[PDB]
Amino acid sequence: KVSRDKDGSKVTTVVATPGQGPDRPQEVSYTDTKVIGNGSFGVVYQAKLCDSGELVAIKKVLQDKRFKNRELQIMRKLDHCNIVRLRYFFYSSDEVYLNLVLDYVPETVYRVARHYSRAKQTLPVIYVKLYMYQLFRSLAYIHSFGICHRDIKPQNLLLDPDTAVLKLCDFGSAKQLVRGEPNVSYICSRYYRAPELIFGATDYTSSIDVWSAGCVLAELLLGQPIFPGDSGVDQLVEIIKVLGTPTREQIREMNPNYTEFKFPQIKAHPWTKVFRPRTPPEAIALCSRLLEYTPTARLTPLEACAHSFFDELRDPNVKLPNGRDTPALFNFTTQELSSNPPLATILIPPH
Amino acid sequence: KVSRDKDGSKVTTVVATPGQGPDRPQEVSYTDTKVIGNGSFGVVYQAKLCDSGELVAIKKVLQDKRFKNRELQIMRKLDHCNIVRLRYFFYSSDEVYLNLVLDYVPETVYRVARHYSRAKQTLPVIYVKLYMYQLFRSLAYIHSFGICHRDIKPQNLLLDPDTAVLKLCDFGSAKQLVRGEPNVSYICSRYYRAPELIFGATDYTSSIDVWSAGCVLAELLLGQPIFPGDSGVDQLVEIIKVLGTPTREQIREMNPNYTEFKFPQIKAHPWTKVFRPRTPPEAIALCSRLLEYTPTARLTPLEACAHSFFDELRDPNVKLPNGRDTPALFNFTTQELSSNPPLATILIPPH
Numbered sequence: 001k002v003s004r005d006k007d008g009s010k011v012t013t014v015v016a017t018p019g020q021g022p023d024r025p026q027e028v029s030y031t032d033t034k035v036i037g038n039g040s041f042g043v044v045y046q047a048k049l050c051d052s053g054e055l056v057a058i059k060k061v062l063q064d065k066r067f068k069n070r071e072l073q074i075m076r077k078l079d080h081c082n083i084v085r086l087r088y089f090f091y092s093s094d095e096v097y098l099n100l101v102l103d104y105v106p107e108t109v110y111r112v113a114r115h116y117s118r119a120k121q122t123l124p125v126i127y128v129k130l131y132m133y134q135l136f137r138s139l140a141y142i143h144s145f146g147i148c149h150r151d152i153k154p155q156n157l158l159l160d161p162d163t164a165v166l167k168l169c170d171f172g173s174a175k176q177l178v179r180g181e182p183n184v185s186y187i188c189s190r191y192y193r194a195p196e197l198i199f200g201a202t203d204y205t206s207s208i209d210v211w212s213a214g215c216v217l218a219e220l221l222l223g224q225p226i227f228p229g230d231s232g233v234d235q236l237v238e239i240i241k242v243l244g245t246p247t248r249e250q251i252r253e254m255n256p257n258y259t260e261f262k263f264p265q266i267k268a269h270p271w272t273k274v275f276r277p278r279t280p281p282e283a284i285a286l287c288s289r290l291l292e293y294t295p296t297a298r299l300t301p302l303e304a305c306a307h308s309f310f311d312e313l314r315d316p317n318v319k320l321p322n323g324r325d326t327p328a329l330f331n332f333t334t335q336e337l338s339s340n341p342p343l344a345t346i347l348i349p350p351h
Numbered sequence: 352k353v354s355r356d357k358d359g360s361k362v363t364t365v366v367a368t369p370g371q372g373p374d375r376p377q378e379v380s381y382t383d384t385k386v387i388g389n390g391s392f393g394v395v396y397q398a399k400l401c402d403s404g405e406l407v408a409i410k411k412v413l414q415d416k417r418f419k420n421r422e423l424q425i426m427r428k429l430d431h432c433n434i435v436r437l438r439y440f441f442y443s444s445d446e447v448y449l450n451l452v453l454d455y456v457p458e459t460v461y462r463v464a465r466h467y468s469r470a471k472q473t474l475p476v477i478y479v480k481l482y483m484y485q486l487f488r489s490l491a492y493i494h495s496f497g498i499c500h501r502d503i504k505p506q507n508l509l510l511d512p513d514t515a516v517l518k519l520c521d522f523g524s525a526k527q528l529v530r531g532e533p534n535v536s537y538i539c540s541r542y543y544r545a546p547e548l549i550f551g552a553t554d555y556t557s558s559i560d561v562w563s564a565g566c567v568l569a570e571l572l573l574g575q576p577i578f579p580g581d582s583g584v585d586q587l588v589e590i591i592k593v594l595g596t597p598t599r600e601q602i603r604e605m606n607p608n609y610t611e612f613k614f615p616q617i618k619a620h621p622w623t624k625v626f627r628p629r630t631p632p633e634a635i636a637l638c639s640r641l642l643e644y645t646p647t648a649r650l651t652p653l654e655a656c657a658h659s660f661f662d663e664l665r666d667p668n669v670k671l672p673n674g675r676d677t678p679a680l681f682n683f684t685t686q687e688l689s690s691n692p693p694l695a696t697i698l699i700p701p702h
């Protein structure tokens with residue numbers, strides 16, 4: 001149903017299923033439709049809900065009538081203050097397309113980081129603290145269902161610039177991981193791709209997203225990607241220029257069934273000398289505990305939230321630089337704490 | 352057949368059909384196997400042919416037993432001094448893999464350009480002339496069969512640093528184009544992606560590779576990508592920051608059936624001011640005649656080879672910077688000249 005309104009604006013009307021709650025299709029009307037993105041998956045639009053005037057993203061993907069949609073199924077399970085809400089899905093135009101209708105979120109971490117790096121400055125550490133902590137929160141939520149995003153990268157970290165709320169988005173590579181069932185290795189964006197994936201591992205874990213997260217923290221301290229690989233294997237070169245060649249024991253922990261890369265024995269660069277001189281040590285320390293070769297040695301997301309780097313966040317006297325209070329950082333559910341319930345003592349200050 | 356040799360080296364032995372010549376499967380033995388690349392498709396290896404000691408690349412793709420391999424079919428038709436030779440294909444390990452055996456070529460244009468940009472210098476224009484001319488030669492060859500590479504980019508331009516010979520590679524996106532059969536629009540690497548592709552055009556031509564080639568020339572003069580889009584649609588933004596908004600007549604030439612991008616009316620930046628001050632004008636001029644919105648207005652590859660920018664190449668007294676003579680630049684076939692045979696007078700100096 002394409003019509004015009006009281007003011008002659010082009011209104012689209014569609015029959016859409018709520019994203020969460022009962023499978024009960026209501027009619028939905030939106031206008032001001034424009035393309036804000038595209039990829040292999042399809043197009044992303046901005047539109048405005050008529051009824052409420054709220055802004056949304058609509059991700060339009062092609063749907064194999066016969067195949068069921070992985071991304072849809074995950075989006076429908078998820079409800080978290082740091083994950084973008086699926087409000088509705090619907091279908092449209094002899095091929096069938098799936099449309100996901102999500103909260104619009106005005107900025108991303110990529111676009112913010114660039115503003116700074118183009119002006120040769122680093123994001124103040126309080127912005128880095130707020131963003132990383134919230135990302136780890138989102139990761140802990142989803143990893144507690146065995147869901148692994150597999151494309152953690154700054155362009156997929158939305159933020160509201162006034163509240164500093166972070167919403168994880170683009171579950172187009174997400175997948176519930178299953179011990180024993182193999183996974184594609186060419187996944188995740190080059191720079192944020194965990195080393196085991198570059199080695200062809202098909203039996204990895206949700207700890208690949210922690211690496212991805214480390215690459216981002218690093219990026220926000222550095223002002224540029226830490227591992228700027230030109231190609232899939234050059235990435236490994238770049239990881240090695242910092243971490244040095246891994247032990248054989250590490251290379252096993254990543255992928256037991258691997259192949260010959262045969263690179264020169266380079267020695268590990270000192271961590272502190274990677275970053276600029278005033279870089280908070282707490283930050284560099286956390287960085288080190290994320291960017292480990294041995295996937296099982298990387299912190300957990302809940303573990304990462306608990307790191308001393310995020311102590312300033314747990315200060316009662318903390319405010320956003322614009323004077324407003326911090327978004328809800330402490331209101332953990334049971335599902336969120338499942339991975340390690342006793343960490344609640346640190347993550348939840350009295351106040 | 353995995354064995355050991357006279358010197359105890361791990362020798363792999365396989366049954367492989369020559370790429371060119373009669374369909375006659377011979378035994379082939381190679382050693383010194385290592386991974387030099389990977390992508391969605393699979394892995395790329397270096398190995399050494401035992402018999403001759405020659406180096407090769409082996410691109411391993413997964414083969415749907417039922418689907419036939421586009422890339423294989425094209426590779427087998429192609430034979431050109433500026434395209435990487437398929438020496439052999441074979442199959443290996445419940446899944447079947449196709450292995451393509453190609454001449455090893457030590458360097459690429461991407462890696463050479465970067466060495467320079469990292470040292471804040473631009474490639475001498477004679478290297479830009481040699482590389483661009485040879486690319487256009489390769490493009491003219493393949494376009495004379497209606498084959499369109501569809502992923503022209505500097506990482507896919509291999510070169511021997513001593514001879515300055517360029518071989519085009521990665522035909523993983525190539526396709527014999529067919530009037531009235533649609534083509535996927537999300538193709539080609541972002542920066543080198545022709546505008547009509549970003550507009551969703553499924554009815555494009557081998558003229559998209561000329562665009563891509565213009566983006567490379569530009570890159571080599573600039574020291575960095577001319578159109579550094581962060582996303583699929585942002586690319587269009589970046590193209591527009593230079594060329595300015597296209598007329599409605601152009602937007603039709605690219606895609607008659609398009610959709611709402613709704614961007615600001617920006618004014619064309621002067622061409623000369625895009626590049627640095629000493630940039631030879633012939634270069635900027637050629638660049639302008641490649642990077643046109645209207646696909647039919649872009650030069651042809653044979654046209655491009657003819658352009659005055661390449662006059663220095665056609666000077667009898669011309670040498671490589673290393674003192675040695677220039678590679679074979681003039682030995683055009685009939686197939687190469689088919690698109691416009693009379694250009695032969697300029698392309699083929701008396702000497």
Ligand SMILES: c1cncc(-c2nc3ccc4ncc(N5CCOCC5)nc4c3o2)c1
Nearest residue numbers: 057084102103104105106107108169170172
């Ligand atoms: C690619 C693949 N799959 C999903 C996504 C995606 N989901 C959303 C949700 C909400 C969004 N809200 C805003 C937005 N703007 C604004 C920030 O810069 C451009 C993207 N983009 C959004 C978006 O993009 C992207």
Ligand SMILES: c1cncc(-c2nc3ccc4ncc(N5CCOCC5)nc4c3o2)c1
Nearest residue numbers: 395408435453454455456457458459520521
């Ligand atoms: C990806 C998709 N389709 C094809 C390929 C591929 N074909 C060749 C041929 C020959 C090659 N020779 C060398 C080489 N090195 C070393 C120097 O350049 C970078 C990779 N890479 C080669 C290559 O890669 C890769």
